[PDB]
Amino acid sequence: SRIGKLLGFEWTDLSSWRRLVTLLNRPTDPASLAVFRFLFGFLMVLDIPQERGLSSLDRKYLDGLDVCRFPLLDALRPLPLDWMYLVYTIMFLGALGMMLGLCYRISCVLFLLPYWYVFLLDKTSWNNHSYLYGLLAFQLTFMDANHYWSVDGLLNAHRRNAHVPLWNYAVLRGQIFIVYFIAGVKKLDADWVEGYSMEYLSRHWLFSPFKLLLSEELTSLLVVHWGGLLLDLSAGFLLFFDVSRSIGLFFVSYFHCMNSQLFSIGMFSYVMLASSPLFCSPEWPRKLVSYCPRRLQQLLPLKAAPQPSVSCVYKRSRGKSGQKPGLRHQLGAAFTLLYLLEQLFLPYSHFLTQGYNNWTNGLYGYSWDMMVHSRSHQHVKITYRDGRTGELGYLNPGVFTQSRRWKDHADMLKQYATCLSRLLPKYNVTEPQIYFDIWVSINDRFQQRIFDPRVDIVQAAWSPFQRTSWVQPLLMDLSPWRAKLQEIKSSLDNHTEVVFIADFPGLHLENFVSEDLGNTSIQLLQGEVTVELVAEQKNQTLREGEKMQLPAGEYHKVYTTSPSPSCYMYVYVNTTELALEQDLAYLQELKEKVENGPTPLVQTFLRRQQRLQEIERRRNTPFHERFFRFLLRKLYVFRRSFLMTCISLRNLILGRPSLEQLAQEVTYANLRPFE
Amino acid sequence: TVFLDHENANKILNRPKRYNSGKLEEFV
Ligand SMILES: CCCCCCCC/C=C/CCCCCCCC(=O)OC[C@H](COP(=O)(O)OCCN)OC(=O)CCCCCCC/C=C/CCCCCCCC
Numbered sequence: 001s002r003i004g005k006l007l008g009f010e011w012t013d014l015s016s017w018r019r020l021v022t023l024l025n026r027p028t029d030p031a032s033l034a035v036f037r038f039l040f041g042f043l044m045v046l047d048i049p050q051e052r053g054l055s056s057l058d059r060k061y062l063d064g065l066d067v068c069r070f071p072l073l074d075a076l077r078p079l080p081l082d083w084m085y086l087v088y089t090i091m092f093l094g095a096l097g098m099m100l101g102l103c104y105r106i107s108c109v110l111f112l113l114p115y116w117y118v119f120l121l122d123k124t125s126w127n128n129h130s131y132l133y134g135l136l137a138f139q140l141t142f143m144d145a146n147h148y149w150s151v152d153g154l155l156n157a158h159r160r161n162a163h164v165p166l167w168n169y170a171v172l173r174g175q176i177f178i179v180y181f182i183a184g185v186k187k188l189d190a191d192w193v194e195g196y197s198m199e200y201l202s203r204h205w206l207f208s209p210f211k212l213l214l215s216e217e218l219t220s221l222l223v224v225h226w227g228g229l230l231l232d233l234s235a236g237f238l239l240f241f242d243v244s245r246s247i248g249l250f251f252v253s254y255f256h257c258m259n260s261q262l263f264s265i266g267m268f269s270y271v272m273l274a275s276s277p278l279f280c281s282p283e284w285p286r287k288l289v290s291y292c293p294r295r296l297q298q299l300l301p302l303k304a305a306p307q308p309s310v311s312c313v314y315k316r317s318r319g320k321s322g323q324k325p326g327l328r329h330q331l332g333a334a335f336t337l338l339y340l341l342e343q344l345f346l347p348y349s350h351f352l353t354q355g356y357n358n359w360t361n362g363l364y365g366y367s368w369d370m371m372v373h374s375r376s377h378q379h380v381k382i383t384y385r386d387g388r389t390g391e392l393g394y395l396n397p398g399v400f401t402q403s404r405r406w407k408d409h410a411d412m413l414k415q416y417a418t419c420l421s422r423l424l425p426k427y428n429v430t431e432p433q434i435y436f437d438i439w440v441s442i443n444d445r446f447q448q449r450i451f452d453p454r455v456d457i458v459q460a461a462w463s464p465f466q467r468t469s470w471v472q473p474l475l476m477d478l479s480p481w482r483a484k485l486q487e488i489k490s491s492l493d494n495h496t497e498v499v500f501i502a503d504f505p506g507l508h509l510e511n512f513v514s515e516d517l518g519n520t521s522i523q524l525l526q527g528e529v530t531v532e533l534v535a536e537q538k539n540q541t542l543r544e545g546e547k548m549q550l551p552a553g554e555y556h557k558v559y560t561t562s563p564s565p566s567c568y569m570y571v572y573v574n575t576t577e578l579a580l581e582q583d584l585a586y587l588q589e590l591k592e593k594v595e596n597g598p599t600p601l602v603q604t605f606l607r608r609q610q611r612l613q614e615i616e617r618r619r620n621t622p623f624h625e626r627f628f629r630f631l632l633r634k635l636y637v638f639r640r641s642f643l644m645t646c647i648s649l650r651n652l653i654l655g656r657p658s659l660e661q662l663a664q665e666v667t668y669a670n671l672r673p674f675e
Numbered sequence: 676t677v678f679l680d681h682e683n684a685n686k687i688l689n690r691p692k693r694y695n696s697g698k699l700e701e702f703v
């Protein structure tokens with residue numbers, strides 16, 4: 001029975017449906033599940049005001065503001081602001097009751113339904129950790145997590161210290177393992193394994209110890225990328241097995257503790273840290289409280305033999321023969337199997353939802369592809385054609401949007417175009433044709449268009465299950481250029497910038513070089529292009545290698561005339577910045593020399609000196625002051641959440657008092673308690 | 676503003692906004 005001790009079960013337990021049900025409903029200690037429930041509820045209580053947007057609800061759902069929203073289904077609409085505050089209140093109460101274990105089933109539902117409603121209301125708020133919170137709440141809804149360390153058991157003794165079925169731990173462990181393993185498999189991407197995804201990250205001071213034995217490139221490639229990929233691929237296996245659990249726990253704890261400081265990912269790292277002990281024995285909190293000194297052993301509740309529970313069946317040789325598997329047991333086993341199968345399948349289901357497939361696969365948030373794809377957006381142009389007069393106009397990129405994710409997804413772009421066509425009549429624009437010229441570089445590739453700029457997105461066809469025709473393909477046979485691009489970028493001066501552009505055949509780039517962008521040049525790297533100067537109506541054909549100087553404050557056009565995609569460079573200098581810096585340096589040096597033996601230009605120098613002095617002082621300032629400031633900001637966020645929620649709840653229950661009273665209440669809500 | 680002119684709409688060689696970290700979709 002070596003396999004039995006290594007796995008927790010035997011091969012005979014999987015040879016029949018009845019034995020699988022019996023194994024998956026075997027009684028288990030609920031202490032570990034209870035501690036995880038308490039910690040998850042606490043972290044959700046902390047996260048509702050911060051990341052879920054309770055503190056900025058009045059800004060996001062203002063009751064008269066023109067805004068383009070991006071729900072998963074267009075039939076889903078946000079409620080008025082007071083009702084949105086009620087939804088967030090119900091979600092917060094559900095999180096409170098989940099953390100406490102009080103009215104656990106109702107509290108689970110009361111957190112789950114508004115949480116998923118808020119999730120589906122806005123596709124642009126989707127990420128992997130919010131999706132994980134939804135999944136964890138869904139799982140915990142069906143579990144007996146209030147059998148320990150809960151006030152439900154403190155007000156009802158039968159629920160106290162009652163055993164839970166084994167599938168409660170199996171589903172959660174499978175979820176955590178799936179997160180780790182699918183993240184690792186998604187990191188088996190050419191961009192990640194070649195160190196392109198997160199190449200700036202190694203220069204964080206938290207990676208200093210590795211630099212005592214590695215170079216910058218080596219710690220970027222081996223530690224951040226290969227190290228992260230190995231950790232993701234091996235964390236579930238290390239945590240599952242008893243022999244490797246201490247090492248796995250240490251590595252996973254280090255991973256999450258570094259991630260909490262490297263990134264702003266809400267409470268994800270703490271949720272994963274709290275999920276790690278789910279792989280330990282279900283009795284570990286009991287051992288932890290039994291290892292304490294005897295002086296603190298008379299106030300905690302006595303640790304006795306847990307009582308039998310009805311939620312799980314008992315199979316004994318002496319204690320009767322056995323009992324038939326009840327409907328609840330089969331339902332739990334089937335839920336375990338089906339849910340884990342769905343969790344395995346969904347990250348690789350993008351071949352069905354082709355309409356959500358851009359350069360990357362699917363909507364972001366449920367594939368566990370964290371930090372794999374980095375996007376740099378160079379420029380967005382939104383042009384409309386008036387359907388009545390034929391006049392061409394241009395919109396500010398993102399007028400009525402609260403997010404930038406529409407730049408990368410054809411579904412969000414279609415929603416944005418529909419919203420603009422609905423809203424622009426209010427701005428004296430008849431039925432508009434709207435075109436999008438969006439330039440993106442993904443993982444330091446050539447900047448290129450993601451959508452067809454000649455296609456009217458208002459009338460363009462989009463379907464969930466069909467690949468979008470107006471999405472430009474990613475120029476994959478140009479990635480090996482990245483080493484050369486990086487060499488060019490690092491081989492430049494400190495005042496010059498470079499933009500690398502790849503353009504499709506038959507298309508052209510209309511460019512207005514700013515007046516202050518003197519010394520602007522274009523150099524061809526691949527294919528052939530024709531550069532047209534609009535003012536002089538002159539076309540000069542470029543070949544591979546030649547560089548052309550371009551005028552500032554004037555228009556020019558780059559036509560890709562080659563049958564294959566062309567790549568060219570833009571090297572430019574902020575010449576006004578050069579003049580400003582040289583005159584500022586000369587003025588400062590002359591003044592210093594005269595003294596030792598106001599105007600905006602000197603105002604900039606004074607501001608820079610003051611900022612440098614403040615930065616130096618803050619570095620010299622003890623971290624207790626920084627901690628106090630951080631706590632004050634968080635307390636402001638929580639106080640504002642509470643006060644605006646109270647205002648809206650009173651509006652719902654009693655009514656709106658008056659404009660003056662509401663204004664005074666809102667002013668008091670933003671008071672910045674102790675600044 | 677709501678509308679841009681032909682001039683400011685076509686200056687691709689502008690400094691990007693760089694609002695926080697607009698590179699990774701995982702960040703808040
Ligand atoms: C081989 C079947 C899968 C079982 C896991 C094999 C382990 C090898 C690598 C997996 C690493 C971690 C995976 C995630 C853990 C989830 C499963 C789990 O908790 O199993 C342990 C647990 C025993 O618990 P303790 O005695 O505490 O064991 C502690 C270890 N000393 O055993 C079980 O729960 C038995 C579960 C039977 C399998 C059901 C769960 C897995 C479902 C697979 C997902 C796909 C659905 C069905 C697939 C159809 C085709 C097979």
Ligand SMILES: CCCCCCCC/C=C/CCCCCCCC(=O)OC[C@H](COP(=O)(O)OCCN)OC(=O)CCCCCCC/C=C/CCCCCCCC
Pocket residue numbers: 032035036039046264265266267270271273274275276277278631634635638703
């Ligand atoms: C009626 C009650 C009234 C209460 C009034 C109190 C008055 C005192 C005022 C203080 C207010 C502070 C409250 C807020 C709490 C802390 C703030 C907080 O969490 O902030 C988030 C902060 C970082 O946020 P950033 O994203 O950097 O913020 C910048 C925004 N981009 O995150 C955290 O620090 C998370 C804190 C949670 C830690 C708790 C433990 C987490 C889990 C780890 C457990 C380890 C494993 C244990 C094993 C068991 C597992 C089964």
Ligand SMILES: CCCCCCCC/C=C/CCCCCCCC(=O)OC[C@H](COP(=O)(O)OCCN)OC(=O)CCCCCCC/C=C/CCCCCCCC
Pocket residue numbers: 071072073074346353356363366411412414415416418462464
């Ligand atoms: C249903 C909630 C699931 C929560 C999702 C969380 C992550 C799960 C992974 C799936 C993510 C996205 C896949 C969604 C597929 C279904 C989408 C859908 O039906 O509606 C899309 C589309 C909305 O388009 P927008 O881009 O908002 O409009 C642009 C114009 N302004 O809606 C419509 O066109 C109307 C109805 C479309 C056809 C109805 C669907 C019939 C087929 C049924 C299968 C689809 C659902 C299967 C569920 C899978 C389990 C998650």
Ligand SMILES: CC(C)CCC[C@@H](C)[C@H]1CC[C@H]2[C@@H]3CC=C4C[C@@H](OC(=O)CCC(=O)O)CC[C@]4(C)[C@H]3CC[C@]12C
Pocket residue numbers: 042045046638639640642643673
């Ligand atoms: C003398 C006058 C000016 C009274 C003003 C007092 C306010 C500053 C108080 C009133 C309501 C208080 C809030 C009431 C409830 C909470 C919930 C509480 O929620 C928790 O997260 C604690 C439990 C947990 O850690 O999970 C955090 C403090 C906070 C925001 C309190 C912060 C301070 C507030 C805003």
Ligand SMILES: C/C(=C\Cc1c(C)c(O)c2ccccc2c1O)CCC[C@H](C)CCC[C@H](C)CCCC(C)C
Pocket residue numbers: 179180183184198223224225227228231232251254255256258259263268269272370371
């Ligand atoms: C950017 C990285 C991972 C993305 C990510 C994040 C942020 C998560 O939150 C995840 C949570 C669960 C599952 C997957 C996640 C995920 O994919 C690697 C970041 C580099 C990392 C910090 C370097 C450390 C690598 C090894 C472990 C360090 C060596 C160990 C020493 C103690 C010897």
Ligand SMILES: *[C@@H]1O[C@H](CO)[C@@H](O[C@@H]2O[C@H](CO)[C@@H](O)[C@H](O)[C@H]2NC(C)=O)[C@H](O)[C@H]1NC(C)=O
Pocket residue numbers: 493496519571573
């Ligand atoms: C425009 O900028 C380019 C580069 O930003 C300048 O070219 C440099 O000229 C110096 C000579 O003073 C050389 O040492 C460098 O190697 C050149 N760099 C490159 C990339 O070619 C050019 O001189 C600038 N033009 C003006 C008029 O100032």
Ligand SMILES: *[C@@H]1O[C@H](CO)[C@@H](O[C@@H]2O[C@H](CO)[C@@H](O)[C@H](O)[C@H]2NC(C)=O)[C@H](O)[C@H]1NC(C)=O
Pocket residue numbers: 506508530532537538539559561
């Ligand atoms: C510069 O070259 C282009 C060819 O790339 C000339 O023709 C234009 O080509 C674009 C791209 O196919 C078409 O959309 C235009 O309709 C073409 N005609 C015009 C008038 O733009 C272009 O004419 C040349 N410019 C000059 C001043 O001769």
Ligand SMILES: CC(C)CCC[C@@H](C)[C@H]1CC[C@H]2[C@@H]3CC=C4C[C@@H](O)CC[C@]4(C)[C@H]3CC[C@]12C
Pocket residue numbers: 112113114116117134135138342343346
């Ligand atoms: C009042 C309504 C809108 C609140 C939202 C409730 C419904 C829509 C919510 C409740 C629980 C949610 C499910 C919870 C878990 C999963 C598994 C995941 O892999 C895909 C989505 C899916 C299947 C969710 C779909 C949406 C869902 C069914």
Ligand SMILES: *[C@@H]1O[C@H](CO)[C@@H](O)[C@H](O)[C@H]1NC(C)=O
Pocket residue numbers: 514516517574576577688689690
């Ligand atoms: C530098 O050039 C950019 C154009 O790319 C411009 O936006 C910026 O204002 C210039 N610098 C200064 C100090 O004006």
